[PDB]
Design a protein around this ligand. Structure first.
Ligand SMILES: CCCCC/C=C\C/C=C\C/C=C/C/C=C\CCCC(=O)O[C@H](COC(=O)CCCCCCCCCCCCCCCCC)COP(=O)(O)O[C@@H]1[C@H](O)[C@@H](O)[C@H](OP(=O)(O)O)[C@@H](O)[C@H]1O
Ligand SMILES: CCCCCCCCCCCCCCCCCC(=O)OC[C@@H](COP(=O)(O)OC[C@@H](N)C(=O)O)OC(=O)CCCCCCCCCCCCCCC
Ligand SMILES: *[C@@H]1O[C@H](CO)[C@@H](O[C@@H]2O[C@H](CO)[C@@H](O[C@@H]3O[C@H](CO)[C@@H](O)[C@H](O[C@@H]4O[C@H](CO)[C@@H](O)[C@H](O)[C@@H]4O)[C@@H]3O)[C@H](O)[C@H]2NC(C)=O)[C@H](O)[C@H]1NC(C)=O
Ligand SMILES: Nc1ncnc2c1ncn2[C@@H]1O[C@H](COP(=O)(O)OP(=O)(O)OP(=O)(O)O)[C@@H](O)[C@H]1O
Ligand SMILES: *[C@@H]1O[C@H](CO)[C@@H](O[C@@H]2O[C@H](CO)[C@@H](O)[C@H](O)[C@H]2NC(C)=O)[C@H](O)[C@H]1NC(C)=O
Ligand SMILES: [Mg+2]
Lengths: 1066, 350
């Protein structure tokens, strides 16, 4: 049990409860080392370098320095640590904005509320919360500025809803108004352990007099917001990570990318190639030293057993050929992924103007997997809708009245009964004069739209009238009635005064009785008198329960209203039908008694209040129906359509009702009025099991075609999904979900949102995306491969722990199609070009062991080869993986099918990886063969009979291998901008200038004194310049022809788009 | 506060001036035609330039077992390789001469019926000599060959097999400067039968940087000892006159330059600004380096320096090979453009 004292700060500290802080950071000051080591050493190249550094420590077997590989591994580790530290500093800076908000606390030594920060609240402190202020922690309410104690809490962040939740205080524990008289609070409270089971609370507070029980009816959780109140007094029970909502949320996990998992499988093949090369070299060396031992007496070999020599040769050729796995790759890849994540968060098309919060990428490691997404797990309230309800259309006397007539129907057709649309000015002109047949009906409907409700009015200081309603649809109806001409003004028991726009005369209705709203009745009824002496009763509700409440005998306006309701519900409008009745007092003389007897039963009031109203329904006069729309965000249906066209299966997971999530889907065109809704609303495990079995049986009996599948949706309920998610027989739900066009889950807990994602990602091979708003879908964001959050509106916890923080839902159309297909293509080639450029040079060292008795003598030296991937071949990868685009941005949004090119492995795989390694062997072999033929016996110089030696020949190999990789980078580049002209042709001019200066001032300083006079024997000769034209062209003549052939006679889907952009012809 | 709006620069918004290259059929075929029409003349020029070189390789190995001492005997065909502008009449001949002690010599009599007008060079060709071994390239004290008198424990570890012999320093340590080719070539082509002598020289045959970095030693004549393989000509250690300076010993400099391949040339003699007239010539070579040390061949090469040095068609063939790939694919791609109509486009299978 959890015990908590009421009014002391000395005894509660002995329990060691958590504070009120939040930490969305990945690393901490006590776990950085192990997590960083597990993240960095999870690859197969860092482990390779670590094992290589352990080989050089063996004596004699290390020919060069003993700190050549560990010194570089430390550099790459420091670079990765600096990147992670910058990201964590940014995350902590973003987090700091929450723990510094104002929060008043009651002090016993001050007897006054002091304004502090959101990090200083402890367990058991009295907190005063104002209106429209986020709740600091799980506070049990103790007082409020309302009679008896009432408050409205909006839980749009606890779980997607629209209606305000009612909360109250206990008796004898609600008279604590004003700051004073808060000193007699003595005792203790016992509650349960912090659990994520919402809507449940059991316990008792042991006051100084007696015990007071508790219930979830007076338990406000962290995330809600007060509405239509002034101030509330709360006692903190849970805080920090002990909150029932922010409990399962953990730190940012290590999210691996599908590119990294493919690289790990690409390094393994390089290891087998290296092992084969080392074995070949060692066997050759052993055979040469054993057989031809009498013809090598000028070398003065040691002479030992073959077993003792094979091990030494293996250890030597390990370090000698350890450069096949480039170290500069896993550093360049980090910088490329960090730079291309900064360019994404600087686009004006992904920046919100009316809020000034641009897109951020707080995780630059998974920026390249945005173009491989196959599933999108969205959210309704907060992510798709704008949480705004408005009166759109109306239906009166079988006629639709709408403010702005659309272009789909425009005018009427008048087939049988009038069906169509007409402007509101016609309604106004027909209501003005009483000579029309529908004037009294419209009048009664307008009085209905501004009376029968529970809206509380409030006059502001400026003079504006504000409405306070626990239900947003009632507030929308009231606003519609007001701006239509019937402005409801004041309300008080047995008094409703509404101001009429016409004649400027206010009315006065004596409100007698009004029945509350229940989930079983689904009606709102109000019976009162009009200022004339007659009794009228209004009743509005859904067309399911009120149809069996009236009979037809004269009002032949039923079928038209049914057609109108069917036309409204086919677009995603929440409709409500309304009925009036005029009854006399002869039946009221007993109706008052049969109603007020419900206040006499002191045992079951919820059993009598509903049946007391079910006795006044004989024949209702149907007036019509209304339409209350919920506005979506800007560009939501178009984004859904574009993402569905690109081959992405969009799902919806909301913790709202099923009826509210069904019509949300017909408005954004996610569903249609012709698809089969596989509704699964079962209460037990056997029920949903049989439902799934019969669904698979009915779907398997057909052979399927182009139709059938595009008209199939899957609607799932909360408890039904909880029974369909158990490990025992769960594939029945996954086999059917892959055949429906859309899936919508309703009333799902915040834990199930992550369970669905974890089940999809573990039983498939696709990449998921989880976009959501509010702290109710945080775990889901921490459960998918890419977590995108919404920042700006109500709720920011989903945008602080996510990976990308957008401002609108429409930006997701450009973050995936343009900034996703590019990053997948940029990071691919930039890697495949490196593995090739490191192979076209260091493979000559393996072709040279057949000419030096398998000794392993390097062709070039250490300093020249060390500058290869550092000074002259480092910029082409950056300019390829950052500032390159194979297609324009205007064409990726025009043809979404191109996104499928990134959906499947078409640019980066192991089979394509072999195409660049084999191409690297070919170029190195060509260079070696061409160089060992031109320089026969060194007699390749026309300078007084002097000959070219070892170092004068290695410069030709190093220079020829540089022009070849730059030629390949030029043939690969699709853009050719100003940053490319300094990386591919500028790096070639760099070496040609760097070599003569380096080889003339450094050998004098006792640093690489082998290039003492090679500049005369290389630059001063005519053969060195005649090779650099015939070898790079002979080695690159195979790719230049194959590129043209593939582009012309076997064009791919993107080769035609690239040609369409060049000539500008569609 | 801050507007937090990204700038409207052409760099941040990723909109820069590009080119967009497309390998159009009217861009690749003319390129190939140009490459072929350029590489054909240079190819022919580099091919004809290697035919103007006249050389004569006489494998003088096996002289101590296949040459007679009484008179001259004909050399087998598998040992001579001659390329002249004209044609010889009498075949090359050789003889073995045994003078005092055991210093044998090989006398090779050859013919020059071409009247060479280019500068003459004389090298020796060593076969199957791995001078590029990992423990052979870097095997010499750089400070010791610089003239400085290095101490005992201050020598560099490259001279690992031989360095100190009974607390005595070796002046040329390491694997190199120990297996030096010590076959002394005659410094004059002795003309016979109505022909004159042809004087040769061995000066300025090494690199200009080797003659500037090989300084005269400053060691003590009683503190250094010769290498193990230098004892037949330097007995009883080094003396006052027995101190070979590496400044003027240009053969030492030309041998210290480590080659790149097991088959390498090494310059010994040269004669410029003079023509080689026709007639019979004789060359005397002292046999001191046994072929059993490395199991290869010792040749005598008399060449003339051309545009790329010696007869080597490996450079002119490549220039003609690329053209062979430009006049082939550049033609099979032209016949596919007229005899096989290609679709314009708008066939995207999306
Ligand atoms: C005995 C006489 C022989 C006479 C031979 C005469 C004629 C032979 C004919 C052809 C030679 C061989 C032809 C090979 C056959 C077909 C070539 C297929 C080429 C191929 O698509 O895949 C390549 C494999 O990388 C090699 O290129 C593989 C190169 C392999 C060639 C050599 C194979 C043996 C290599 C062994 C070397 C070992 C030597 C060891 C010797 C040691 C001695 C000491 C790699 O993709 P790729 O970079 O081209 O990229 C392509 C395409 O180029 C590009 O335009 C496309 O769009 P974009 O433009 O947007 O990117 C891109 O999507 C992609 O489709
Ligand atoms: C004109 C404007 C041009 C601007 C161009 C800027 C380009 C630089 C722009 C640098 C941008 C760098 C971005 C990332 C690129 C890769 C860097 C990287 O990966 O760094 C690891 C390691 C490489 O080591 P490894 O190659 O993988 O393994 C060696 C092994 N092969 C062997 O045998 O030893 O580096 C180090 O450890 C730091 C110390 C380097 C010392 C050498 C430079 C001397 C400078 C001094 C060298 C002398 C310079 C003399 C100048 C005259
Ligand atoms: C031209 O170059 C030839 C090869 O480089 C060279 O022939 C070698 O000459 C060396 C020097 O004499 C020979 O080495 C000697 O070999 C004998 C065994 O045959 C060793 O006993 C001897 O060591 C001796 O050690 C004794 C103490 O244990 C002591 O009396 C002396 O210190 C003595 O050094 C030498 O190591 C070698 O066998 C020769 N052949 C080969 C294939 O190396 C020619 O002499 C050289 N000629 C000239 C004129 O430069
Ligand atoms: N002001 C109103 N008076 C009466 N009925 C209303 C009013 N506003 C909406 N309704 C109707 O109330 C009905 C609500 O049904 P509800 O949504 O309550 O079922 P639920 O989805 O089963 O509830 P939960 O799932 O939240 O337990 C809707 O069909 C709607 O048309
Ligand atoms: C040019 O060659 C001739 C011919 O060998 C050299 O003359 C020889 O010199 C040596 C040295 O004293 C004598 O032993 C020979 O008897 C000489 N031969 C003849 C035929 O005279 C001459 O020395 C050479 N020139 C130079 C500068 O070395
Ligand atoms: Mg939401």
């Amino acid at each position: 049990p959890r015990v908590i004292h009421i009014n002391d700060s000395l005894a509660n500290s002995s329990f060691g409860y958590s504070d009120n802080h939040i930490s969305t950071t990945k690393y901490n000051f006590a776990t950085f080392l192990p997590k960083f080591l597990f993240q960095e050493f999870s690859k197969y190249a860092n482990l390779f370098f670590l094992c290589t550094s352990a080989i050089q420590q063996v004596p004699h077997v290390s020919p060069t320095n003993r700190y050549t590989t560990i010194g570089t591994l430390l550099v790459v580790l420091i670079v990765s640590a600096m990147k992670e530290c910058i990201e964590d500093i940014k995350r902590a800076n973003s987090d700091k904005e929450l723990n510094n908000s104002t929060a008043e606390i009651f002090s016993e030594a001050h007897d006054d509320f002091v304004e502090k920060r959101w990090i200083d609240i402890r367990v058991g402190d009295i907190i005063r919360v104002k209106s429209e202020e986020p709740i600091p922690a799980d506070t049990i309410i103790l007082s409020s500025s309302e009679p008896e104690g009432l408050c409205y809490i909006e839980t749009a962040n606890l779980d997607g809803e629209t209606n305000l939740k009612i909360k109250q205080s206990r008796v004898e524990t609600a008279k604590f108004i004003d700051v004073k008289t808060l000193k007699n609070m003595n005792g203790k409270v016992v509650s349960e352990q912090p659990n994520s089971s919402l809507y449940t609370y059991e316990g008792t507070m042991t006051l100084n007099d007696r015990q007071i029980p508790l219930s979830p009816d007076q338990m406000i959780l962290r995330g809600a917001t007060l509405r239509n109140t002034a101030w509330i007094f709360g006692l903190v029970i849970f805080t920090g990570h002990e909150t029932k909502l922010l409990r399962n949320a953990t730190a940012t996990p290590i999210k691996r990318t599908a590119v990294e998992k493919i690289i790990n499988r690409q390094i393994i093949a390089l290891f087998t190639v290296l092992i084969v090369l080392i074995l070949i070299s060692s066997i050759g060396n052993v055979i040469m030293s054993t057989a031809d031992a009498k013809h090598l007496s000028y070398l003065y070999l040691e002479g030992t057993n073959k077993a003792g020599l094979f091990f030494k040769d293996f250890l030597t050729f390990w370090i000698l050929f350890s450069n096949l796995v480039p170290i500069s790759l896993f550093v360049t890849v980090e910088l490329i992924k960090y730079y291309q994540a900064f360019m994404i968060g600087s686009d004006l098309d992904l920046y919100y103007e009316k809020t000034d919060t641009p897109t951020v990428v707080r995780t630059s490691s998974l920026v390249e997997e945005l173009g491989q997404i196959e599933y999108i797990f969205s959210d309704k309230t907060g992510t798709l809708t704008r949480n705004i309800m408005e009166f759109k259309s109306c239906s009166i006397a079988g006629h639709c009245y709408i403010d702005k007539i659309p272009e789909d129907k425009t005018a009427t057709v008048e087939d049988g009964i009038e069906v169509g649309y007409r402007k509101f000015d016609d309604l106004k002109k027909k209501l003005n004069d009483p000579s029309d047949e529908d004037s009294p009906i419209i009048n009664d409907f307008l009085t209905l739209l501004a009376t029968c409700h529970t809206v509380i009015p409030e006059f502001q200081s400026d003079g504006s009238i504000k409405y306070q309603a626990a239900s947003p649809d009632e507030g929308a109806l009231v606003q519609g009635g007001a701006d239509l001409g019937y402005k409801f003004i004041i309300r008080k028991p047995n008094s409703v005064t509404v101001l009429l726009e016409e004649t400027g005369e206010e009315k006065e209705y004596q409100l007698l009785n009004i029945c509350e709203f229940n989930s079983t009745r689904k009606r709102m009824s109000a019976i009162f008198r009009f200022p004339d002496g007659s009794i009228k009763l209004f009743c509005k509700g859904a067309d399911t329960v009120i149809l069996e409440r009236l009979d037809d005998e004269a009002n032949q306006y039923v079928e038209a209203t049914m057609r109108h309701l069917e036309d409204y519900a086919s677009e995603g409008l929440r409709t409500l039908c309304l009925a009036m009745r005029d009854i006399s007092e002869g039946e009221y003389e007993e109706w008052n008694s049969i109603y007020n007897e419900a206040a006499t039963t002191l045992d079951n009031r919820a059993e009598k209040l509903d049946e007391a109203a079910n006795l006044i329904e004989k024949n209702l006069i149907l007036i019509g129906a209304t339409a209350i729309e919920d506005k979506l965000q800007d560009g939501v249906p178009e984004t859904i359509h574009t993402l569905q066209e690109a081959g992405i299966k969009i799902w919806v997971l909301t913790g709202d009702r099923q009826e509210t999530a069904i019509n949300i889907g017909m408005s954004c065109r996610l569903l249609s009025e012709d698809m089969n809704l596989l509704i699964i609303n079962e209460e037990t495990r056997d029920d949903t099991e049989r439902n799934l079995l019969e669904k698979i049986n009915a779907l398997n009996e057909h052979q399927l075609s182009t139709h059938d599948m595009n008209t199939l949706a899957l609607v799932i309920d909360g408890k039904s999904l909880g029974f369909a998610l158990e490990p025992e027989l769960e594939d029945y739900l996954l086999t059917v979900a892959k055949l429906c066009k859309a899936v919508i889950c309703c009333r799902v807990s915040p834990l199930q949102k992550a369970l669905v994602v974890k089940m999809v990602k573990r039983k498939s091979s696709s990449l998921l995306l989880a976009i959501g708003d509010g702290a109710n879908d945080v775990s889901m964001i921490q459960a998918a491969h890419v977590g995108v959050g919404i920042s700006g509106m109500e709720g920011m916890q989903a945008a602080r722990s996510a990976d990308i923080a957008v401002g609108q839902f429409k930006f997701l159309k450009k973050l995936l199609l343009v900034h996703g297909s590019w990053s997948y293509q940029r990071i691919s080639v930039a890697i495949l070009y490196s593995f090739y450029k490191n192979t076209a040079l260091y493979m000559t060292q393996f072709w040279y062991v057949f000419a030096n008795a398998f000794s392993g003598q390097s062709i070039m030296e250490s300093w020249t080869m060390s500058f290869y991937n550092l000074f002259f071949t480092v910029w082409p990868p950056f300019v390829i993986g950052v500032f390159d685009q194979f297609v324009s941005s205007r064409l990726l949004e025009r043809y979404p099918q191109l996104y499928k090119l990134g959906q499947k492995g078409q640019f980066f795989s192991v089979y394509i990886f072999w195409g660049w390694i084999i191409n690297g062997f070919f170029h190195s072999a060509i260079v070696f063969i061409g160089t060992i033929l031109i320089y026969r016996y060194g007699f390749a110089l026309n300078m007084h009979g002097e000959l070219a030696d070892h170092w004068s020949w290695g410069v030709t190999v190093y220079t020829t291998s540089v022009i070849i990789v730059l030629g390949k980078a030029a043939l690969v580049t699709n853009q050719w901008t100003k940053f490319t002209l300094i990386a591919i042709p500028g790096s070639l001019l760099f070496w040609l200038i760097f070599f003569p200066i380096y080889a003339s001032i450094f050998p004098h300083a006792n640093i690489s004194r082998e290039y003492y006079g090679v500049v005369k024997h290389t630059y001063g000769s005519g053969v060195f310049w005649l090779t650099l034209i015939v070898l790079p062209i002979f080695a690159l003549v195979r790719d230049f022809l194959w590129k043209y052939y593939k582009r012309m006679y076997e064009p791919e889907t993107y080769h035609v788009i690239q040609e369409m952009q060049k000539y500008n012809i569609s | 506060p801050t507007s937090k709006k990204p700038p409207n620069t052409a760099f941040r918004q990723q909109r820069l001036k590009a080119w967009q290259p497309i390998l159009s059929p009217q861009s690749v075929l003319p390129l190939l035609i140009f490459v072929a029409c350029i590489f054909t003349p240079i190819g022919i020029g580099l091919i004809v330039s290697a035919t103007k070189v006249q050389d004569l390789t006489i494998d003088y190995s096996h002289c101590d077992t296949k040459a007679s001492t009484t008179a001259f005997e004909d050399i087998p065909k598998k040992y001579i390789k001659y390329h002249f502008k004209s044609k010889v009449e009498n075949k090359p001949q050789w003889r073995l001469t045994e003078n005092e002690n055991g210093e044998q010599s090989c006398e090779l009599q050859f013919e020059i019926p071409n009247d060479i007008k280019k500068s003459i060079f004389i090298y020796y060709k060593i076969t199957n000599f791995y001078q590029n071994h990992r423990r052979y390239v870097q095997s010499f004290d750089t400070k010791q060959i610089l003239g400085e008198p290095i101490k005992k424990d201050d020598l560099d570890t490259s001279c690992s097999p031989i360095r100190s012999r009974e607390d005595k320093i070796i002046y040329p340590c390491g694997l190199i400067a120990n297996s030096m080719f010590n076959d002394t070539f005659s410094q004059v082509l002795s003309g016979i039968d109505d022909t004159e002598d042809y004087n040769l020289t061995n000066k300025h045959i090494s690199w200009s940087i080797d003659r500037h970095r090989f300084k005269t030693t400053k060691y003590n004549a009683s503190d250094i000892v010769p290498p193990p393989n230098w004892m037949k000509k330097y007995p009883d250690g080094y003396t006052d006159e027995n101190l070979p300076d590496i400044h003027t010993w240009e053969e030492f400099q030309v041998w210290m330059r480590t080659a790149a391949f097991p088959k390498f040339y090494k310059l010994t003699l040269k004669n410029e600004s003079a023509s080689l007239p026709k007639g019979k010539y004789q060359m005397n070579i002292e046999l001191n380096y046994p072929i059993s040390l490395f199991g290869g061949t010792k040749s005598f090469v008399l060449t003339t320096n051309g545009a790329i040095g010696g007869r080597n068609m490996s450079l002119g063939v490549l220039y003609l090979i690329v053209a062979g790939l430009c006049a082939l694919f550049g033609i099979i791609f032209l016949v596919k453009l007229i005899f096989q109509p290609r679709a314009m486009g708008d066939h995207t299978y999306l």
